[PDB]
Amino acid sequence: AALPQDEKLITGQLDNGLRYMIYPHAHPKDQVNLWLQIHTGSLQEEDNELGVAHFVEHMMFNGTKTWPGNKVIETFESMGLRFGRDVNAYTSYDETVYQVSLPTTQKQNLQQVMAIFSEWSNAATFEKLEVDAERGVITEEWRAHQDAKWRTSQARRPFLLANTRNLDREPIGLMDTVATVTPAQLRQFYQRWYQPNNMTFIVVGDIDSKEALALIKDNLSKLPANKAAENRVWPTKAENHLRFNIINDKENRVNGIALYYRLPMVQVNDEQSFIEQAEWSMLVQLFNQRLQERIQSGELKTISGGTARSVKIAPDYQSLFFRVNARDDNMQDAANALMAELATIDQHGFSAEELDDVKSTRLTWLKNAVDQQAERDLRMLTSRLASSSLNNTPFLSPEETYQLSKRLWQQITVQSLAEKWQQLRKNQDAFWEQMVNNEVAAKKALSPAAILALEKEYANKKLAAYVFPGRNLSLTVDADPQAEISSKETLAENLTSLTLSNGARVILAKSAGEEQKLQIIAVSNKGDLSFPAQQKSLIALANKAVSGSGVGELSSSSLKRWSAENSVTMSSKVSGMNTLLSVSARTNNPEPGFQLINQRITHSTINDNIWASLQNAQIQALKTLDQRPAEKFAQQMYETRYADDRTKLLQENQIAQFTAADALAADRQLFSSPADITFVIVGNVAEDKLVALITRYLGSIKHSDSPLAAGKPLTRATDNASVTVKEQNEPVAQVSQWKRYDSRTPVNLPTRMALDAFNVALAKDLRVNIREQASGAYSVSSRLSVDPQAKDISHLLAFTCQPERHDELLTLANEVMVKRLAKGISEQELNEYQQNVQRSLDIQQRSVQQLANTIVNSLIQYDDPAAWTEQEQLLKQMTVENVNTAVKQYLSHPVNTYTGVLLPK
Ligand SMILES: [Cl-]
Ligand SMILES: [Cl-]
Ligand SMILES: [Zn+2]
Numbered sequence: 007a008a009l010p011q012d013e014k015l016i017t018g019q020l021d022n023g024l025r026y027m028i029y030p031h032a033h034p035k036d037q038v039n040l041w042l043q044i045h046t047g048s049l050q051e052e053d054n055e056l057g058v059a060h061f062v063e064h065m066m067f068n069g070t071k072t073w074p075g076n077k078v079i080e081t082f083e084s085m086g087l088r089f090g091r092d093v094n095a096y097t098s099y100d101e102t103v104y105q106v107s108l109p110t111t112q113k114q115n116l117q118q119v120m121a122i123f124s125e126w127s128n129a130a131t132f133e134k135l136e137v138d139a140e141r142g143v144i145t146e147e148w149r150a151h152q153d154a155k156w157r158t159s160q161a162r163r164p165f166l167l168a169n170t171r172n173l174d175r176e177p178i179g180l181m182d183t184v185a186t187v188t189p190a191q192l193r194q195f196y197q198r199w200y201q202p203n204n205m206t207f208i209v210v211g212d213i214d215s216k217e218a219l220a221l222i223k224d225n226l227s228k229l230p231a232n233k234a235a236e237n238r239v240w241p242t243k244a245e246n247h248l249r250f251n252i253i254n255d256k257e258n259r260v261n262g263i264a265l266y267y268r269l270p271m272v273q274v275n276d277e278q279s280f281i282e283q284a285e286w287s288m289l290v291q292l293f294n295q296r297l298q299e300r301i302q303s304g305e306l307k308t309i310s311g312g313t314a315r316s317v318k319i320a321p322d323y324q325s326l327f328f329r330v331n332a333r334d335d336n337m338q339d340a341a342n343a344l345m346a347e348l349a350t351i352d353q354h355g356f357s358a359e360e361l362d363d364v365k366s367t368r369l370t371w372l373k374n375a376v377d378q379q380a381e382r383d384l385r386m387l388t389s390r391l392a393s394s395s396l397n398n399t400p401f402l403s404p405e406e407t408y409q410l411s412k413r414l415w416q417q418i419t420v421q422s423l424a425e426k427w428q429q430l431r432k433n434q435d436a437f438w439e440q441m442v443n444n445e446v447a448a449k450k451a452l453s454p455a456a457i458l459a460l461e462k463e464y465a466n467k468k469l470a471a472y473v474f475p476g477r478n479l480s481l482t483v484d485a486d487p488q489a490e491i492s493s494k495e496t497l498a499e500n501l502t503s504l505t506l507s508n509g510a511r512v513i514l515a516k517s518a519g520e521e522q523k524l525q526i527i528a529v530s531n532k533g534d535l536s537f538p539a540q541q542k543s544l545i546a547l548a549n550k551a552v553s554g555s556g557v558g559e560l561s562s563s564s565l566k567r568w569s570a571e572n573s574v575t576m577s578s579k580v581s582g583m584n585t586l587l588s589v590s591a592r593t594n595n596p597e598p599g600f601q602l603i604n605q606r607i608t609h610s611t612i613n614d615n616i617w618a619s620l621q622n623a624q625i626q627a628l629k630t631l632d633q634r635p636a637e638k639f640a641q642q643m644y645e646t647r648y649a650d651d652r653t654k655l656l657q658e659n660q661i662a663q664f665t666a667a668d669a670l671a672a673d674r675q676l677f678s679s680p681a682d683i684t685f686v687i688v689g690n691v692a693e694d695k696l697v698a699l700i701t702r703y704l705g706s707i708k709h710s711d712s713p714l715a716a717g718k719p720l721t722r723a724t725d726n727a728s729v730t731v732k733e734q735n736e737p738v739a740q741v742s743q744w745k746r747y748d749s750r751t752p753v754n755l756p757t758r759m760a761l762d763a764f765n766v767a768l769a770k771d772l773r774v775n776i777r778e779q780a781s782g783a784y785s786v787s788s789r790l791s792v793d794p795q796a797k798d799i800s801h802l803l804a805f806t807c808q809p810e811r812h813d814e815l816l817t818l819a820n821e822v823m824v825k826r827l828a829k830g831i832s833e834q835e836l837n838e839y840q841q842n843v844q845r846s847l848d849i850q851q852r853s854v855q856q857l858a859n860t861i862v863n864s865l866i867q868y869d870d871p872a873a874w875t876e877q878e879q880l881l882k883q884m885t886v887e888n889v890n891t892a893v894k895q896y897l898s899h900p901v902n903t904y905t906g907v908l909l910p911k
Contacts, residue, residue, distance in 0.1 A: 057179015
């Protein structure tokens with residue numbers, strides 16, 4: 007919506023209307039830039055005042071009240087200030103500027119200079135003798151600087167400045183006006199525009215806010231609060247036809263061809279216009295990048311060089327041109343290279359690799375601009391502020407420029423730049439221009455008909471696409487010399503445990519068979535239950551958003567290319583008590599796998615567009631929840647089973663208040679503490695090369711400050727509830743019954759096997775008795791959940807039936823449960839289960855991904871990564887009485903029962 011002005015910059019206005027800008031800077035130490043900017047140039051001149059704005063500029067140095075004649079010049083010289091090196095002045099179409107650069111050390115010199123600035127504002131005398139002498143000064147300067155470059159721009163002017171006020175308002179004006187202007191006319195223009203409200207005083211340099219303000223208020227406050235004339239605006243009318251020019255000048259030393267486009271120029275004052283300008287800027291940069299790359303590779307031997315550039319032609323307009331410089335006098339070759347370059351872009355556009363190199367190049371410069379900002383060129387910085395003052399655009403800090411660029415450039419695609427290019431190529435306000443410096447080049451110079459015929463030739467050719475090389479991509483991490491392996495332990499036959507100097511744990515396992523795939527799973531003991539009620543629901547979203555973005559100095563697109571080139575894949579998942587970060591690779595190229603795990607942890611980024619989509623989707627989902635009755639009811643039940651603020655759905659405001667930066671900060675907190683991480687590495691790599699990668703990439707990760715305590719499980723509701731909701735407009739009754747059981751002792755691997763064997767048997771009796779029984783349920787479910795941290799087991803019994811049968815079938819499902827619980831398991835059911843699990847236990851050490859997730863599931867479910875290894879032995883140790891005594895101990899009497907019935911109406 008709007009851009010933020012630099013914090014360092016102090017801007018105001020005095021009671022009399024005068025605007026001020028103060029910016030502190032100390033690259034040239036104890037130096038200050040004092041600029042008086044008049045928001046009036048030559049555009050404001052009347053038909054009988056052509057050159058008056060510039061004549062007035064000159065007359066500021068030729069007499070005032072206190073300093074008549076050349077006394078002002080003599081005064082600056084007494085302070086060691088010389089016109090041309092310390093004191094300057096210029097007039098353009100848009101403004102008149104009076105500039106002084108001087109030391110901050112001599113305080114009375116600063117005062118005298120401010121007193122001179124005061125007199126330039128309203129005390130100019132315009133003495134008749136002094137006026138007559140300047141006429142000559144101005145006339146001789148104009149006569150003397152009519153060189154090759156001046157004649158070239160003079161020749162280009164009618165084409166470039168077509169339909170502008172600027173065309174008819176060159177700052178120098180007419181020599182006839184210079185010779186005939188009366189001191190009264192010069193006085194008239196000066197009184198008209200030299201008024202405080204049309205002026206800005208700029209102060210850039212080694213001075214504090216207190217001192218710089220007192221320098222302004224002491225001298226410029228006294229200026230009478232007069233109102234200047236209103237500045238007029240001449241909007242540029244498009245010249246919607248193609249023009250042609252040939253510039254012949256023997257003094258020019260570069261022969262060539264150029265295509266100029268004329269289009270509006272936006273003022274960067276919001277996000278939309280920031281991007282709009284960046285798109286034009288990137289099309290210029292993309293053209294130059296491709297051209298340099300085609301010259302350096304020897305693909306364009308027929309030409310010298312060439313460039314794309316954009317230039318301001320009016321306050322509201324600009325020109326974007328594409329120039330090709332001819333080899334000696336080879337005009338036809340130059341024409342062919344330019345038209346072949348442009349036609350290629352029409353046909354294939356620019357590649358993602360091209361767009362990314364341009365972006366990464368610019369951001370690197372903007373990164374180095376942030377660091378080296380105190381070393382900025384004072385003149386460059388001062389002129390940049392004066393430009394912002396002129397155009398009424400926010401002055402952005404090097405930091406804010408770096409932030410806005412990375413965030414808003416993500417909105418610039420190969421597709422968005424292709425339409426911008428198509429729009430530009432369809433623009434009729436254009437002209438072809440050739441440059442010839444001899445009679446051989448002039449004869450070879452293309453006619454308008456020849457240019458147009460050449461344009462059609464390449465338009466109808468099926469040109470070959472340009473393959474851009476693309477920069478070498480790496481996620482190389484500098485090793486920590488002080489990173490070691492602290493402890494070693496053997497967990498099982500094929501399980502090794504390493505603890506690192508940073509407190510991280512590493513589980514190593516080799517997979518039998520030459521699959522050549524490596525899996526690294528970073529397991530954090532922090533999940534979404536380590537966050538407040540406003541955050542819980544957004545943690546998984548935040549993590550998906552962060553994992554779908556770039557990493558390190560790579561964009562999402564450069565990450566995709568690097569991933570494919572280095573044969574790697576990545577995924578992540580946010581659980582209630584944990585976060586998993588899965589990375590796959592090749593055993594022949596394992597280093598990239600480790601680099602990506604490290605960079606996802608230490609250098610995570612967030613794409614703003616992916617987060618906005620997840621926000622908007624979440625808001626939409628909340629908005630249209632009445633359209634999803636089952637979901638709505640399942641949510642009501644979730645809030646019924648628990649007495650926790652965290653179960654509640656977030657409102658629209660809560661979703662919007664969680665920003666991309668809040669989301670990036672939360673995701674960072676999960677893998678913030680290395681001591682909370684267990685890296686599961688599964689595959690066949692030479693352990694000596696493997697330990698080198700573990701210390702370099704997993705032992706290097708440092709502790710990051712985070713307030714995250716161990717996850718708090720949801721507070722379970724202390725009282726039972728039997729809810730009935732008549733919301734469905736479907737003739738299906740949906741019944742859910744949850745039974746909660748407390749675990750006196752934790753559920754270990756043998757007990758979970760017993761309880762699961764029982765539930766397989768239980769789910770059988772429910773299918774035969776509730777579903778298969780005539781006029782029964784349409785579906786039935788019997789699921790068993792175990793929460794180790796909460797120290798409880800949950801049993802969900804779900805079914806959908808005819809509404810008239812919901813009470814009868816629940817009664818029958820509960821009595822079937824009682825009967826199974828009393829009966830227990832049979833020898834046949836136990837052996838059925840034992841055979842079933844054994845088959846799955848032989849195919850658990852099959853895939854590198856499967857085995858890794860087995861170790862992971864052990865760590866999460868039993869706080870022991872080796873628990874799974876003792877399974878086959880425990881499976882052949884399971885007895886009828888063993889499971890029956892485990893069922894009687896962990897499923898006999900519930901601490902709570904929650905019932906939910908979703909009915910029609
Ligand atoms: Cl003239
Ligand atoms: Cl701008
Ligand atoms: Zn001049």
